[PDB]
Design a protein around this ligand. Sequence first.
Ligand SMILES: C[As](C)(=O)[O-]
Ligand SMILES: [Ca+2]
Lengths: 266, 202
Amino acid sequence: HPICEVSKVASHLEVNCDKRRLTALPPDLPKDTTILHLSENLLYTFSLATLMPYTRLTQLNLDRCELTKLQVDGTLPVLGTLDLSHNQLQSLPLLGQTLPALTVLDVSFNRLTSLPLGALRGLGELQELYLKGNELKTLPPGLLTPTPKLEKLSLANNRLTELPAGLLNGLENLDTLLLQENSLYTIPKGFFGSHLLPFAFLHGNPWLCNCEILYFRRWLQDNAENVYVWKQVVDVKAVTSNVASVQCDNSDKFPVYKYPGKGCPT
Amino acid sequence: PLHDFYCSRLLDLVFLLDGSSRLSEAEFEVLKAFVVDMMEQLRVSQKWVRVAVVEYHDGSHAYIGLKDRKRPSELRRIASQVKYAGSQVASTSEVLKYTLFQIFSKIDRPEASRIALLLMASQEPQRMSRNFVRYVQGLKKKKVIVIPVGIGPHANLKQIRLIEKQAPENKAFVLSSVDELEQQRDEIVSYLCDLAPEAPPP
Ligand SMILES: C[As](C)(=O)[O-]
Ligand SMILES: [Ca+2]
């Protein structure tokens, strides 16, 4: 190919078109491409239908491409991974009818202010969803209903003030939930259900310690070993167990799991 | 430097560095030099051979991830500059938990050998070891080979033996100090070479 680098790693045909000041998809890519890197280009707009000739495409990286709009139509039958992180998307595209085999979706660090109803419909194979670093205030009901296989969910560093009571419904395989650095103040009763959740990040929220936090306090007490702090300094990412990181707003860093709840109804 | 031998393999290799006070700062530098040596011998390039580097004490501190797209010399530099923690506690259970769920959760490259090199010099409080076996079994199901390297007289031998019993491939190495790292490096690297599928020299 005259523009992009073509490389073969094991069974994968990796095509590298990144960091090339591209404003559009280069034509005549190898038809047996399985991985396409378009990262760090000047695309601003892109259309998934233009990738339909590449019937073996399983991974697509469109990160850091200044995307403001992603046109979605046609079908990429075997795409498993889509990276749309670090763009400027204001609305989440509906990918379900175009990417039925998608298992990983990353739209972190965009400009999402809301998620549409039935946003994830048709994405039955989805296992990882990253929406960290957006501007989400609330989530629609049944958001994760069409994604029962979900294993990782990242909603960290948004502006969430509430979570839907049935957010984690039907998620028997969830192992990582990231909700740190939002504006959450309470957890609805029954939110976590009975499913074991190995990793939960809940620090950096203004938890309101009143009688409404009691369900949360109990869950924290029962799951103290599953509550973690996420911290990135320079390039080093740190993940550390610390249930005391979940703290009451308007206090001397008082941990929610120790909140007495004096005067609350029994 | 010129090592005794080199080999290119289709391999995902995770270095897990004990960050307890059981190792002095100078000894930790020997551990880090050992890691860099292995990266050189294995011709690490984040292409056919990918690496992750985690220092663990109370929690996991990830300096390199398998999908980090950086040039080899930068990877080696990063590993050599891993900060000494010298903490009281280095939890093996937490770092294996982290490895199972956060590093090796998704098998994007099933043809590659997956190895967790667990470099141990300390012994976590038994309070933290309740799910230790579950995590080793978890890695087994994920086709991840766990290679415990015990360093010094304070290495958790009990956990090392437990790792061995979960799967035949989990070969253990027991060293008297960090000075034996370079002495047994060839044997450890050789085991990886004979274990993993071959890769083209870049
Ligand atoms: C020859 As040497 C001890 O640097 O592997
Ligand atoms: Ca050296």
